[PDB]
Chain A
């Protein structure tokens, strides 16, 4: 028994935490729905680009060093990495993963 007042204050603080996290969960679900809608809107453009690229790559065979960005350059010595991470925390294990 610390005190009735102190435990009541802790109860109020944790209730405020619960309300804040509930609001965060709701807005995160809304943002997830909007992001899924954006992904589905972007998808037809990517599909058409992929189909056109597939046709073009099937067209060209054994070219001069197989283009520039399509070049299968042997003796790999330098690799660049594009890692995408959230701008803010509170995601969970996602950033760590």
Chain B
């Protein structure tokens, strides 16, 4: 890839399971007689990660738009390999088993996923405001999860009830049918532009869709698809 980068061509780099790179390095280091660190990992984990990851960076001659996948052993995000990967990124997406088991198959955790360009100057004022309000509502839901688990929804205040309902609708709304996932979900693939995503989530946060039941936000496109489905059900 560096040849095409150095001559000016843009590069889309997909590296699948960097953790496999790390695990291979760990097995080799175990066979090389090095003294292990933490959970059986190589002492040179940070330097190996730096050696691979620093060559991925885009430069002034050409740009590499990297999209890596990182396996997490068990579900431990505190494992040394993903932890070393975390600091080498401009955008982090976290996939949670709890969200995937709840059938929200684009199981991205919005509270555990960050990005550097999530700035009002870079991406836009409305985009930043909508994303931060969505994250705030989801954080309030995460804080009230223990209340809802045992007491139930009825004990919360009216504002807290509305926040939790909006958060559940937001959690269901993040699910999106994919073109490559037509075998699992019997729905056509859906492409949603970033402007439509921002507008739909702004409309969801404004109050529109409060009368709509939650199940109509599952595996839809923008808010117009949710409205069309709700009107079809009527």
Q: Give the B-binding residues of A (Cβ under 8 A).
A: 1, 14, 17, 21, 89-93, 95-96
Contacts and interface: CB of A to CB of B under 8 A. Distances in A.
**How many B residues touch the partner, as a band?**
under 10
Contacts of B76: 1
Contacts of A95: 154
Contact of B154 (A1, A14, A21, A93): A93
A92 B150 contact: no
Contacts of A17: 150
Contacts of A14: 150
A96 B76 CA distance: 41
A1 B76 CA distance: 8
Interface of B: 76, 78, 150-152, 154-155
A55 B74 CA distance: 79
A91 B151 CA distance: 10
Contacts of A1: 76, 78
A90 B154 CA distance: 8
Given A17-B150, A21-B150, A89-B155, 9 more contacts: A1-B76, A1-B78, A14-B150, A90-B151, A92-B152, A92-B154, A93-B154, A95-B154, A96-B154
Contacts of A92: 152, 154
A41 to B, nearest CB: 31
Contacts of B155: 89-90
Contacts of A93: 154
Nearest to B150: A17
14 contacts: A1-B76, A1-B78, A14-B150, A17-B150, A21-B150, A89-B155, A90-B151, A90-B155, A91-B154, A92-B152, A92-B154, A93-B154, A95-B154, A96-B154
Contacts of B150: 14, 17, 21
A85 to B, nearest CB: 13
A89 to B, nearest CB: 6
A1 B78 CA distance: 9
Contacts of B78: 1
B58 to A, nearest CB: 37
Nearest to A96: B154
B88 to A, nearest CB: 25
Nearest to B149: A14
B106 to A, nearest CB: 27
B169 to A, nearest CB: 20
A10 to B, nearest CB: 9
A16 B85 CA distance: 41
A18 to B, nearest CB: 9
A90 B150 CA distance: 11
| Central interface residue in B78, B150, B154, B155, by most chain A CB within 10 Å | B154
Q: Which 4 A-B pairs have the closest CB atoms?
A: A93-B154, A92-B154, A96-B154, A89-B155
Contacts of B151: 90
Nearest to B152: A92
B65 to A, nearest CB: 35
Nearest to B75: A1
Contacts of B152: 92
